[PDB]
mmCIF file of C-alpha atoms in Angstrom:
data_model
loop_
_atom_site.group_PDB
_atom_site.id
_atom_site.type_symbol
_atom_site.label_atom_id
_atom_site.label_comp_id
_atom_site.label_asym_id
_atom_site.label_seq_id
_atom_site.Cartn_x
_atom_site.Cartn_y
_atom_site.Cartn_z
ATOM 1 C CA UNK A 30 15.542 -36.071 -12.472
ATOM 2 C CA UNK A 31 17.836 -35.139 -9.454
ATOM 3 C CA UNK A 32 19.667 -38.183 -8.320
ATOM 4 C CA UNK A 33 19.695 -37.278 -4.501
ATOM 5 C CA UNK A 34 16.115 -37.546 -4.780
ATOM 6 C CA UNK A 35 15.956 -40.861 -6.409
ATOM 7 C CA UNK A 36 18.271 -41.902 -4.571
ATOM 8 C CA UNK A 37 17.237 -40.860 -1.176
ATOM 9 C CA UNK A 38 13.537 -42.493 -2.492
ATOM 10 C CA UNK A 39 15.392 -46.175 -3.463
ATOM 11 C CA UNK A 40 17.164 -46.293 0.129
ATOM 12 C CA UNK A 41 13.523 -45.503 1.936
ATOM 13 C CA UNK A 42 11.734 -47.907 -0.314
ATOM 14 C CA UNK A 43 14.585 -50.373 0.882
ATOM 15 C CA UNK A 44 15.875 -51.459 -2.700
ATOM 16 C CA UNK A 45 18.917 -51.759 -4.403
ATOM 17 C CA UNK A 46 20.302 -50.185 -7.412
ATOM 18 C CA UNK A 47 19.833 -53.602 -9.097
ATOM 19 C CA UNK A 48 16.017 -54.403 -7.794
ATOM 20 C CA UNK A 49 14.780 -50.804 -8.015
ATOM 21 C CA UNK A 50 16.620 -51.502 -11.989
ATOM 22 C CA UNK A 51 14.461 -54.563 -12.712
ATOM 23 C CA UNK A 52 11.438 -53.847 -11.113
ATOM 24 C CA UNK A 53 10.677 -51.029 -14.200
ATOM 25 C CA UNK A 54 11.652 -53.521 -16.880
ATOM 26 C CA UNK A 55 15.450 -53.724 -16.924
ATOM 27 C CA UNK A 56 17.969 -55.884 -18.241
ATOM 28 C CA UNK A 57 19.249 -57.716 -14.807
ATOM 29 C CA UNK A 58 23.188 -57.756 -16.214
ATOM 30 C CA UNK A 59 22.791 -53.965 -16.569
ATOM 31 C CA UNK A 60 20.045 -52.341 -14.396
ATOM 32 C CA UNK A 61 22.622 -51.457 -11.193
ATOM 33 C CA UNK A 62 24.593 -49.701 -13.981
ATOM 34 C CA UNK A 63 21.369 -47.732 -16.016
ATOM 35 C CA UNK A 64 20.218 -46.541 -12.176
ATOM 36 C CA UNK A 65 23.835 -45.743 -11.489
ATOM 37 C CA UNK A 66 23.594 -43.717 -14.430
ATOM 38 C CA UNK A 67 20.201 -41.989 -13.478
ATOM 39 C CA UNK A 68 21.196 -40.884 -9.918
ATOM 40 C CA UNK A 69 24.743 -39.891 -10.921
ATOM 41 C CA UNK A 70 22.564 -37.675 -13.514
ATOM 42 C CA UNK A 71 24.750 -38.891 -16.434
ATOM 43 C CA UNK A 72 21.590 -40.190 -17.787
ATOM 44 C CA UNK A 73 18.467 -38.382 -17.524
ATOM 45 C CA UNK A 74 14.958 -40.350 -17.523
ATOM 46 C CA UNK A 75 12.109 -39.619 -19.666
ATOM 47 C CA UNK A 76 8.952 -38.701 -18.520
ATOM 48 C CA UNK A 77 7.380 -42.355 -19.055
ATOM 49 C CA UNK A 78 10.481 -43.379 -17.364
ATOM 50 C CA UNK A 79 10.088 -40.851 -14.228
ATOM 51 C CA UNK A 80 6.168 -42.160 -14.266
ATOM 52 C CA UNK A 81 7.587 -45.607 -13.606
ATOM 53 C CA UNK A 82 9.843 -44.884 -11.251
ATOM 54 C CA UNK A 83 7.788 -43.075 -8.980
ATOM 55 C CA UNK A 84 5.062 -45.672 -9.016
ATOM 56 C CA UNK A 85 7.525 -47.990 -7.655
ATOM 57 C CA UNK A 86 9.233 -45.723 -5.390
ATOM 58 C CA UNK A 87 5.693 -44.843 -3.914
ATOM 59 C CA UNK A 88 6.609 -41.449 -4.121
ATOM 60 C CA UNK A 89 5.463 -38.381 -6.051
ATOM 61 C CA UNK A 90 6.932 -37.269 -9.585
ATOM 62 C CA UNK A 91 6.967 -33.826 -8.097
ATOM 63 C CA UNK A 92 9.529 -35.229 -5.379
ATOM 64 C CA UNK A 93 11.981 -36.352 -7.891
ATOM 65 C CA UNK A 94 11.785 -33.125 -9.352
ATOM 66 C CA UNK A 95 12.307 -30.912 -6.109
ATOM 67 C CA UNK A 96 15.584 -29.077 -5.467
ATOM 68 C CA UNK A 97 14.435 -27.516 -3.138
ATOM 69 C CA UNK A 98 15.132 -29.727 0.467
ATOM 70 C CA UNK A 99 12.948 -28.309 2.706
ATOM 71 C CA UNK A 100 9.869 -28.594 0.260
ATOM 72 C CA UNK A 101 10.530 -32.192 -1.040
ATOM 73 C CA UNK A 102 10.848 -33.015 2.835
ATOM 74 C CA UNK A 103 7.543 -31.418 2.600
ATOM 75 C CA UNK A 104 6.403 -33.802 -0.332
ATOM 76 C CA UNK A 105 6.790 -36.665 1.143
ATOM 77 C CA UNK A 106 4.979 -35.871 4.459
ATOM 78 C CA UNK A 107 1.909 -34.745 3.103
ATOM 79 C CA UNK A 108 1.688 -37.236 0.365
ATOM 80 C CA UNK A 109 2.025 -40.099 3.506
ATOM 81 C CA UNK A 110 -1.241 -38.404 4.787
ATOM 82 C CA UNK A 111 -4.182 -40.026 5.496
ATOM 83 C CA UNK A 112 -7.491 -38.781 3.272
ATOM 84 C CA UNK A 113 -8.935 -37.686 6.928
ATOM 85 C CA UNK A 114 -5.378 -35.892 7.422
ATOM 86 C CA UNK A 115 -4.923 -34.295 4.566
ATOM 87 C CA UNK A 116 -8.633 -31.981 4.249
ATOM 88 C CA UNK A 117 -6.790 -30.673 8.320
ATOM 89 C CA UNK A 118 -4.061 -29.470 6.503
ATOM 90 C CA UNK A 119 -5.298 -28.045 3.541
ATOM 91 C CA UNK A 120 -7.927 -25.839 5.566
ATOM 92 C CA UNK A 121 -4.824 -24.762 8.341
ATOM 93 C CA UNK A 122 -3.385 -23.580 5.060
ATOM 94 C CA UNK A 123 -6.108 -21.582 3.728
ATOM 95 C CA UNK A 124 -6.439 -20.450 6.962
ATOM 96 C CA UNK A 125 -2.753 -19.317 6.848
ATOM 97 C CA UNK A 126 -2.594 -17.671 3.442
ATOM 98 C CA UNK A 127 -5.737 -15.663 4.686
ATOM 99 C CA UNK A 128 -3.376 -14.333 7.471
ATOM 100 C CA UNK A 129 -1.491 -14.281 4.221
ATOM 101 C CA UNK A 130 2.041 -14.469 4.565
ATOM 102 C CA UNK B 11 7.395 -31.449 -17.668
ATOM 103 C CA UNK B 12 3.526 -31.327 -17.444
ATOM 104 C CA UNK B 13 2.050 -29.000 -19.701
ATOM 105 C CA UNK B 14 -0.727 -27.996 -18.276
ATOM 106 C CA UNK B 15 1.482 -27.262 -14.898
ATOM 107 C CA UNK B 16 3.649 -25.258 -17.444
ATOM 108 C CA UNK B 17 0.401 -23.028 -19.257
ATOM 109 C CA UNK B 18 -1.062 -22.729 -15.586
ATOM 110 C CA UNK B 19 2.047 -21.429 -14.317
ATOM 111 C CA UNK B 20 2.602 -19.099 -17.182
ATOM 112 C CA UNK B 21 -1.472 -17.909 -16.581
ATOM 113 C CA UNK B 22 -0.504 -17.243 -13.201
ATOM 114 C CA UNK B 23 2.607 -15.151 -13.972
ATOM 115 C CA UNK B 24 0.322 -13.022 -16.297
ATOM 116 C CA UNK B 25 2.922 -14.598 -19.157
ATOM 117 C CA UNK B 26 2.149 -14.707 -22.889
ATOM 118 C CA UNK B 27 3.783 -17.775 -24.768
ATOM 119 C CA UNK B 28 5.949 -15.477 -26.666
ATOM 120 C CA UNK B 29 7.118 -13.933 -23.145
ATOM 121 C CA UNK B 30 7.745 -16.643 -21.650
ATOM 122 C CA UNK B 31 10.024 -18.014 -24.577
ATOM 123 C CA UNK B 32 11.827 -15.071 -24.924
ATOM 124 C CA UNK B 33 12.159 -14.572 -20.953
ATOM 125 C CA UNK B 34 14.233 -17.960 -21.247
ATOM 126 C CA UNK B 35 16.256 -17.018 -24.095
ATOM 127 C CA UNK B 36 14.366 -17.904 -26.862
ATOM 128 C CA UNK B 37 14.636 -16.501 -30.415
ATOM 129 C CA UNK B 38 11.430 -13.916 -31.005
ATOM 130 C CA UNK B 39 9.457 -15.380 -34.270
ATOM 131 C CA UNK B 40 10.170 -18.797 -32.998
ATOM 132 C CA UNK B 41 9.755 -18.261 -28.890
ATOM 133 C CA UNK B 42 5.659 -18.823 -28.950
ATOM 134 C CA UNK B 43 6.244 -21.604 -30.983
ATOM 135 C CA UNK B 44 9.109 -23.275 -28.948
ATOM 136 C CA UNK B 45 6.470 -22.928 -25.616
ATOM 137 C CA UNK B 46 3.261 -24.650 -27.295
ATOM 138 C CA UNK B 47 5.351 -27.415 -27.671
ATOM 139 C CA UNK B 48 5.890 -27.542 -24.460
ATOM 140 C CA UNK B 49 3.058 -26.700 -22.905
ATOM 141 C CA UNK B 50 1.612 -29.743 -25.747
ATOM 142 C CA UNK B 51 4.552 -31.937 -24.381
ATOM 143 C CA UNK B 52 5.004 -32.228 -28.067
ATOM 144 C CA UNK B 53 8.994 -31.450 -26.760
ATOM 145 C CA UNK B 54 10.248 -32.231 -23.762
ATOM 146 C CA UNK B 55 12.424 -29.279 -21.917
ATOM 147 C CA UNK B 56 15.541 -30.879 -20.159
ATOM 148 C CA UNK B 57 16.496 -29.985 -16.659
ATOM 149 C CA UNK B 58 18.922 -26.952 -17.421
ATOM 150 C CA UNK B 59 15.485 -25.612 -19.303
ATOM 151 C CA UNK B 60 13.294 -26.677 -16.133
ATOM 152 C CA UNK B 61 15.243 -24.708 -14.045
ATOM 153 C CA UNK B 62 15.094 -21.581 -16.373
ATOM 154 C CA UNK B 63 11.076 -21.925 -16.292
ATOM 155 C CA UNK B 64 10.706 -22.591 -12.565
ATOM 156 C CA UNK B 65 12.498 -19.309 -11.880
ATOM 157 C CA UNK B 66 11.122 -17.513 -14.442
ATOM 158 C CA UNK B 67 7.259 -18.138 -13.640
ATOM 159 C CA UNK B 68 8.534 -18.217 -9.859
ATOM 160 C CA UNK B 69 6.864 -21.691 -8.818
ATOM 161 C CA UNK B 70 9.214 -24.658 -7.599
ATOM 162 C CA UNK B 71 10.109 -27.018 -10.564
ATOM 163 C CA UNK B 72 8.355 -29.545 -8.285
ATOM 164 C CA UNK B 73 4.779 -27.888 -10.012
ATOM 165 C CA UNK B 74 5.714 -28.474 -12.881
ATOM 166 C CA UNK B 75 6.570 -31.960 -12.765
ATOM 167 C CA UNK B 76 3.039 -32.859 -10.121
ATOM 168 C CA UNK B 77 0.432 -34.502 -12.075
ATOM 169 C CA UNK B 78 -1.253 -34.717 -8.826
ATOM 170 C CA UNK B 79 -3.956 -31.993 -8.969
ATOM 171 C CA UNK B 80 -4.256 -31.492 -5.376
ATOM 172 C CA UNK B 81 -0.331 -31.533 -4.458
ATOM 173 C CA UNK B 82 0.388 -28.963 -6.993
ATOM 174 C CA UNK B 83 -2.060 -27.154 -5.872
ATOM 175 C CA UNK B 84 -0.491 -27.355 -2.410
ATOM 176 C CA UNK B 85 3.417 -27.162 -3.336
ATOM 177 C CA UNK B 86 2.252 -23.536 -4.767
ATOM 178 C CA UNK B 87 0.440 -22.628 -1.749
ATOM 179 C CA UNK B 88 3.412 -24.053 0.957
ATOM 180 C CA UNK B 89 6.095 -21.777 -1.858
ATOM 181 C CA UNK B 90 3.973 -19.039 -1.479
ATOM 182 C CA UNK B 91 4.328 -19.252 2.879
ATOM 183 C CA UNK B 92 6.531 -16.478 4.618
ATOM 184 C CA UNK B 93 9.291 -18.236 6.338
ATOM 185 C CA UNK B 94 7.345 -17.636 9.302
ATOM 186 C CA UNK B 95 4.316 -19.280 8.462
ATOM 187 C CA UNK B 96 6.622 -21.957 6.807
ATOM 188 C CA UNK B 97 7.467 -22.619 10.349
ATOM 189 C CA UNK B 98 4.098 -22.844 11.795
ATOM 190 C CA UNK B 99 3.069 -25.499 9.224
ATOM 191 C CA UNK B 100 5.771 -27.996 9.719
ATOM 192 C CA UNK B 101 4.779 -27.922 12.829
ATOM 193 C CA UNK B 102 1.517 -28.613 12.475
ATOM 194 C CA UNK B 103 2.142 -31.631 9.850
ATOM 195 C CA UNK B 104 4.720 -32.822 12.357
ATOM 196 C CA UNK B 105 1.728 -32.897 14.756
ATOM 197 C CA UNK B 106 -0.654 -34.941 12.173
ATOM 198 C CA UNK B 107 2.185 -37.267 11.230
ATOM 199 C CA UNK B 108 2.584 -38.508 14.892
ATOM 200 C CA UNK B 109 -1.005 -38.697 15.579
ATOM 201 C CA UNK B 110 -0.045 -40.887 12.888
ATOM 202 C CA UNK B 111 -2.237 -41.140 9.386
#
């Protein structure tokens, strides 16, 4: 899991090393230093793990798993989307990559 | 890494397991094998592998890691934007976001 990410989804959620630690089961004397370890990408989380996290976050798996900036950025926006919202954009898409490009 | 994301990508790329496998470095009589375990999450591949597969079957390691059937399908559709229609759609999610929903 790339640590930016999970760390850049922690500081939105508003939680510290030590809640974001607990609130997936940790030990409280050593959850600061086991997510230390995950966003310094010393340690890397298993899937069941990464499940976990992300539920908690409130953000997509997929976003903890995108190098790419300008995509994850992406990630985020459409996944805060509204179920009215989100059928607009995927038919200005289709519409797009019938323009295709 | 999902494996259906992973045997849907490969589909896509017009891959056979043993291709695939070998396309990452992966000894011939073993390479199919390696991949089904995979693709049955039977094995887990670890990020230096991730990164071999996303570029490989060209879709962002994001895919592969969106259990979210109708993200995936749109982080392959957004990838698969010229950076001119790339432009257009930020734009247009920018919009949606501040109409707010």
């Amino acid at each position: 899991m790339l640590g930016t990410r999970l760390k850049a989804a922690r500081i939105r959620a508003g939680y510290s090393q030590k809640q974001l630690g607990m609130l997936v089961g940790m030990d409280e004397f050593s959850a600061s230093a086991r997510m230390n370890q995950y966003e310094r990408e010393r340690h890397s989380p298993n899937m069941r793990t990464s499940e976990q996290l992300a539920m908690v976050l409130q953000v997509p798996m997929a976003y903890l798993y995108c190098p790419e900036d300008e995509l994850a950025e992406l990630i985020l926006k459409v996944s805060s989307l509204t179920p009215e919202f989100k059928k607009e954009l995927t038919r200005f898409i289709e519409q797009l990559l019938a323009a295709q490009g």
